[PDB]
Each structure stands twice: as C-alpha cells, then as structure tokens.
Amino acid sequence: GEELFTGVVPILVELDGDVNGHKFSVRGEGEGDATIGKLTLKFISTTGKLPVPWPTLVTTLLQCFARYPDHMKQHDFFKSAMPEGYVQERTISFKDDGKYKTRAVVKFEGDTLVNRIELKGTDFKEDGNILGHKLEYNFNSENVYITADKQKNGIKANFTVRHNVEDGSVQLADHYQQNTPIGDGPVLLPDNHYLSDQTVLSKDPNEKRDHMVLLEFVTAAGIT
C-alpha cells in the first residue's frame, strides 16, 4: 500500500459533470509525491468554457498523496486501500445555492494513479456566484477533519470551503465526504486527525483552452 507512494507517481484525472443541465468534461494530468505530500496538476475543460468557476471544482479534482508523518502512518486509510483503490463520494452544499454530488473512483492503472469522477449539480441559481461566475480565481486553504466509520469500513470528512466573491462577500461550500475501499482486504482505519492543506491556483501562459494549474501540499496532523 504505502510502498506504492515511495516515489513520484504520474496522475490522470477525468471528470464528467452536469450542473443545472450544463454538461462539461475536464481532464487533468500531473504527478504526486507523498514523501513531501506534493501535488502538481493541470486540468483542462475539453468541452469548451467551464460553466462553473474553477475554484468550485478544486476539492473534487487525491488525498492518498498526503504525507502522513511516521508516527501517524497507521492512520493512513487512503494508501491502505491501494492498489484496488477507494470510492470518494461528496455532497458539496453551496449556501443560498445548489449542491454538487460527486462520486470518484481512485485506483492504480499500472503505475498511474487514476481518479475517475462523476459530478452532478442541481438547484443552482443562474444569477448566483456559481453559474454567474462571480467567484475570484483564488483559494483559502484550511484543515480537513477525518473520522473513521468502522461499520461502513471507511472514513468520513466534514469541512467548509470559503470562496471569495468578486464583491467582497464569501460563498460557503459545505463538504460532506465518504470514502469506501474497493477491495475486500482489510484497511487502516484512523483515529480522529486532520489534513493540513496548502493550495495555490495559477494559469499556463501557453494554454489556449479553459484550464487551471493546481499546486497542493497535503499533510496529516492531530496525533502526537
């Protein structure tokens, strides 16, 4: 499990989405290095312009690349489910707006870690932040809190992303998360801990298509 992440791992992310009827498709590529918990990814909208703001998709677009310090390595559920993988399901509720419902399959295909995501959004107002494209191209990073769910044999996470609106307001995104392993072998189930996130978004100056460059540092903490 954790032996699969000792070196740099190439990454493929494929996303199919529909929000209030607006279909779109996103593909991402890059690499991960869990020794330093580093993610470098570039996503592109293959269906033209994205009908939602890119920041709203950052959390949906590989926590198995988190660096768990040595003293916490028995709490790494994500890497314990590899190579057969795990299913990541989320419900991202946007305040005074709609919600994303995502289901992702995260496993290895050879040496490549593949994240295949289906996203469905409903109840979005066309003049509100998301569909109105009123969110700034930035990201406020915080901690993701993880608890074990022994009965369903996985984990759960509950965190809230704050999106800066162009007018100075803040659009909240309530994330409920579940992860369930695909394989039947036993996995590591953790005590309560958290992932510390550092996220930067940027642009590729030579990329003509609607895209987003993503740099992520994910580290576990909360257990001494």
**Residue 80: enclosing H or E segment and its boundaries?**
helix 77-80
Domains contained in the chain, number: 1
**Bridging pattern class, strands 22-33 and 9-19:** antiparallel
201 forms beta bridges with 214
Q: Phi/psi zone of residue 5: left (φ > 0), alpha (ψ -120 to 50 degrees), beta?
A: alpha
Find, among 50, 49, 80, 51, the residue nearest to 64 by Cα: 80
Domain holding 55, by residue range, is 1-224
d(CA 149, CA 44): 35
Domain CATH for 148: 2.40.155.10
d(CA 161, CA 159): 7
120 forms beta bridges with 18, 101
Which tokens hold the place of 19? 């929000």
d(CA 70, CA 143): 19
